[PDB]
Curated annotation (Swiss-Prot):
Domain of life: Eukaryota
Compartments (UniProt record): Nucleus lamina; Nucleus envelope; Nucleus, Nucleoplasm; Nucleus matrix
Modified residues (Phosphothreonine): T69, T78, T83, T121
Effect listed in the UniProt record for changing R114P: In EDMD2; mis-localized in the nucleus; does not alter nuclear size or shape
Signal peptide stretch: none
PTM: Proteolytic cleavage of the C-terminal of 18 residues of prelamin-A/C results in the production of lamin-A/C. The prelamin-A/C maturation pathway includes farnesylation of CAAX motif by protein farnesyltransferase (FNTA and FNTB), removal of the last three amino acids (-AAX) by RCE1/FACE2 and/or ZMPSTE24, methylation of the C-terminal cysteine by ICMT and endoproteolytic removal of the last 15 C-terminal amino acids by ZMPSTE24. Proteolytic cleavage requires prior farnesylation and methylation, and absence of these blocks cleavage.
Crosslink site: Glycyl lysine isopeptide (Lys-Gly) (interchain with G-Cter in SUMO2): K23, K43, K59
Species of provenance: Homo sapiens (Human)
Gene that this polypeptide is encoded by: LMNA
Protein name: Prelamin-A/C
């Protein structure tokens, strides 16, 4: 339309419930390989606006079909590990044209991506 919703997956991760206009990324491990989320980096490019990333803690692992939730400080989400990873340096994305969000896996390969693409999307 004048907004297209997208996400794309590696398999053993899917961006399963992607909750619009910067509310949450509900992340599930859709194929059955247990992946180390202590070795993650969640990263975002916002428009022609700033370059952010959020870094993960070296202790945790995602299960072959469990659920996890990562998101932004004032999005209605609590600071609640290892289930709700709430980041500080942005509270959500209160203005955007084309937002590209993606998680970098347990070995540093990009595996589960979410894109919200609005005003001037070809």
């Amino acid at each position: 339309s004048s907004f297209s919703q997208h996400a794309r997956t590696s398999g053993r991760v899917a961006v399963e419930e992607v909750d619009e206009e910067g509310k949450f990324v509900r992340l599930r491990n859709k194929s059955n390989e247990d992946q180390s989320m202590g070795n993650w980096q969640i990263k975002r490019q916002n428009g022609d606006d700033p370059l952010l990333t959020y870094r993960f803690p070296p202790k945790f692992t995602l299960k072959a079909g469990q659920v996890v939730t990562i998101w932004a400080a004032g999005a209605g989400a609590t600071h609640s590990p290892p289930t709700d990873l709430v980041w500080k340096a942005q509270n959500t994305w209160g203005c955007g044209n084309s937002l590209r969000t993606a998680l970098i896996n347990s070995t540093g390969e990009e595996v589960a991506m979410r894109k919200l693409v609005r005003s001037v999307t070809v």
